Amino acid sequence: IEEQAKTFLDKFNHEAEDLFYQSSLASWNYNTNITEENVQNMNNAGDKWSAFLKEQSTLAQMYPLQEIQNLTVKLQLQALQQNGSSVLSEDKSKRLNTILNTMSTIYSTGKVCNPDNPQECLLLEPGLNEIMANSLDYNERLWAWESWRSEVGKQLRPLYEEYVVLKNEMARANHYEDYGDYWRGDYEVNGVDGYDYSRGQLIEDVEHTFEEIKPLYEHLHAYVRAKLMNAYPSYISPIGCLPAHLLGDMWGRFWTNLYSLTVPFGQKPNIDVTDAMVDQAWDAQRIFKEAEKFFVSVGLPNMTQGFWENSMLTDPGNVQKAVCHPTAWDLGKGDFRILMCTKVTMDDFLTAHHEMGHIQYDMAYAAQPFLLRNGANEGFHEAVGEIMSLSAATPKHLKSIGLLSPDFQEDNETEINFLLKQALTIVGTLPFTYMLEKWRWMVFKGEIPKDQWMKKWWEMKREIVGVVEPVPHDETYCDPASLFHVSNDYSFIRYYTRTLYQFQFQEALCQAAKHEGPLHKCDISNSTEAGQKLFNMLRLGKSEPWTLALENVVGAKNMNVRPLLNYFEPLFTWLKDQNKNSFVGWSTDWSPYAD
Amino acid sequence: GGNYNYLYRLFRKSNLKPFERDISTEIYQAGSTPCNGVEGFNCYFPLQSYGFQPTNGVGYQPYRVVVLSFELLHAPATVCGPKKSTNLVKNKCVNFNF
């Protein structure tokens, strides 16, 4: 009966909140002060949380799921009843964890040695990522691109084939058709009177939104190709694809390292307020106190006053071994801490606004039950953090926060320099993200057999992304598995939808703050009505369907690409005038070796 | 490490009458199945403990409460406020209260 499930969850909601607390408090003491008497302090305290949750999970199947009427207590029950693994045979369950540990340690400890000196050998993160991000030598970028895929990616090919079979068995025992349908279960919504969403409906909404970005991406692809021919003459065709090893990093995920070759007006400095911070003696604490004044300006609460003692805003005065990585912690019981090692720079002035945005999202849904204290889907949590960073990087906000000469002149040449640096990171990553999840979805359902994995991968690079390989690759390579998110078992569609939600939030908040100009000049400071539009979504958590959360801000029930294109229309107008003598589009027949 | 000595009751058959008190420790029975003094599904111990810890956000830290309740049965009198006294002005037509 349904009233027994309510009494089940309230014993759960008070044993979990304490056991999650000290399992996360011990993870704080390891992260900010590393010993090994802290790693053993967090492994036993971490396993008491994991052993407790599988005990309550096997108690949750005593209650049926379709004999429930209240939507909230049904949502908590389905998130706890989830079997996930453990549906496999107990010798297949230990084979799967052996593969996931072997693929993870090949990616982090794989070395590449030089053919002129076999005694010097580079790892990926120090040394191989620096070549792909800084070099202008064609022959050295071609060496680092091919040798990472032929010496490390060939080890992951027999391991990734066994990984697909075991993950499809686990997904079909949980009544999905494949493992790709298991990943799309985040966006599913069942029976809330007009807000429903199918797991197959996500596939059409991604492909419908993508064919409206292809006019903008084609003009960006044509402008970068014309600028890369001056940097690498006799290597690039003026009507063809771009070679895969000249894109700024190892995989071509972000084009953000191509800015020094593709800058529109290099005689205008892109605005940088780092010298005005060290001329006014701003400490470590000023960067967060101006960040807290931004959020109280819009109508959001202060920091919790436990935030100021418990947090560790710099690396300590001790030479203290403590993972230095910006992050926002939500230990529980209303205890919010930020861990970062901040330097006096406009870079960490902006990520301070980003990391505080995770905190203000966390402080808002802290009145829901324990199992609904996440973002409404996997994409909302990063998207609310980046609309705080866009509004703080504007020169309108910088001159009113005291950091820009009240006699500063923004010209139309510097807005093109700023918008093109945004499009190399935002627009340049959208066909990469769409192509990769489309390839992984077709591998799991079996539309691509294993004798055509690397054949269909490079046909989709030339057609969707416009990127050609420099050396042909047969079915002994596995080039997707040489990325971190593929070999470490992570979903990748959250980076596509976060980019679309980010400009839907920003365009909906700037109509409430009564903006008049272009969308990229907007700032939501001093408003109250925009914050009330934002706070009505922030407090929902997972208690409502995410389509119901979007109408509280945007006014629509689906993700939309038209606010993303309105942000880049000053660039799209300027790009169509720079490509009057160029060719827009590419040919899938040209190759850098096929002459 | 958590002060686990401060408990509260989280299951009862029926809400309390005003100023009523209940220190029993019988195993609660949520479902219809009888409990027979042992724990299990739908048979819960009725007391939980605040695990208080010094690094808790406000609203999670312990507050001490005192409830004063003045009652007036039907006696002849009892405790009350204090009494203020001024100075005695000797020699002058005065308005006095002794």
Ligand SMILES: *[C@@H]1O[C@H](CO)[C@@H](O[C@@H]2O[C@H](CO)[C@@H](O)[C@H](O)[C@H]2NC(C)=O)[C@H](O)[C@H]1NC(C)=O
């Ligand atoms: C890292 O934290 C641990 C524990 O928080 C520190 O180790 C000991 O902590 C106790 C407190 O319970 C002290 O009485 C001991 O003196 C600490 N050990 C030592 C060797 O000092 C540890 O000190 C912290 N790390 C550093 C570098 O201070």
Ligand SMILES: *[C@@H]1O[C@H](CO)[C@@H](O[C@@H]2O[C@H](CO)[C@@H](O)[C@H](O)[C@H]2NC(C)=O)[C@H](O)[C@H]1NC(C)=O
């Ligand atoms: C079941 O649904 C009802 C409404 O559909 C929820 O009722 C609300 O409960 C809160 C506190 O529990 C009250 O403050 C509200 O006034 C109630 N609303 C109404 C309309 O009466 C109820 O909370 C849900 N059950 C659970 C366990 O959350």
Ligand SMILES: *[C@@H]1O[C@H](CO)[C@@H](O[C@@H]2O[C@H](CO)[C@@H](O)[C@H](O)[C@H]2NC(C)=O)[C@H](O)[C@H]1NC(C)=O
């Ligand atoms: C979870 O996996 C189990 C198999 O281990 C599935 O079958 C359940 O088996 C248990 C006994 O171990 C029964 O109590 C359940 O009734 C069975 N399933 C149900 C509730 O029909 C079970 O179907 C899986 N649960 C999910 C999430 O589908």
Ligand SMILES: *[C@@H]1O[C@H](CO)[C@@H](O[C@@H]2O[C@H](CO)[C@@H](O)[C@H](O)[C@H]2NC(C)=O)[C@H](O)[C@H]1NC(C)=O
């Ligand atoms: C920035 O604004 C100036 C001012 O309008 C633009 O200069 C004009 O450019 C057009 C097209 O080349 C000419 O027909 C006008 O005669 C120019 N104006 C003047 C006063 O000379 C300039 O092109 C703009 N730059 C960008 C990048 O948009």
Ligand SMILES: *[C@@H]1O[C@H](CO)[C@@H](O[C@@H]2O[C@H](CO)[C@@H](O)[C@H](O)[C@H]2NC(C)=O)[C@H](O)[C@H]1NC(C)=O
């Ligand atoms: C936006 O908010 C800021 C912060 O309160 C306002 O800045 C104040 O501006 C006045 C006059 O411009 C100064 O006298 C104050 O010293 C400023 N305050 C601070 C804390 O620096 C700003 O005026 C607001 N914008 C509008 C349009 O009202």
Ligand SMILES: *[C@@H]1O[C@H](CO)[C@@H](O)[C@H](O)[C@H]1NC(C)=O
């Ligand atoms: C936030 O804190 C400041 C001082 O730190 C205070 O003046 C302000 O009133 C606080 N905000 C609210 C809503 O009380």
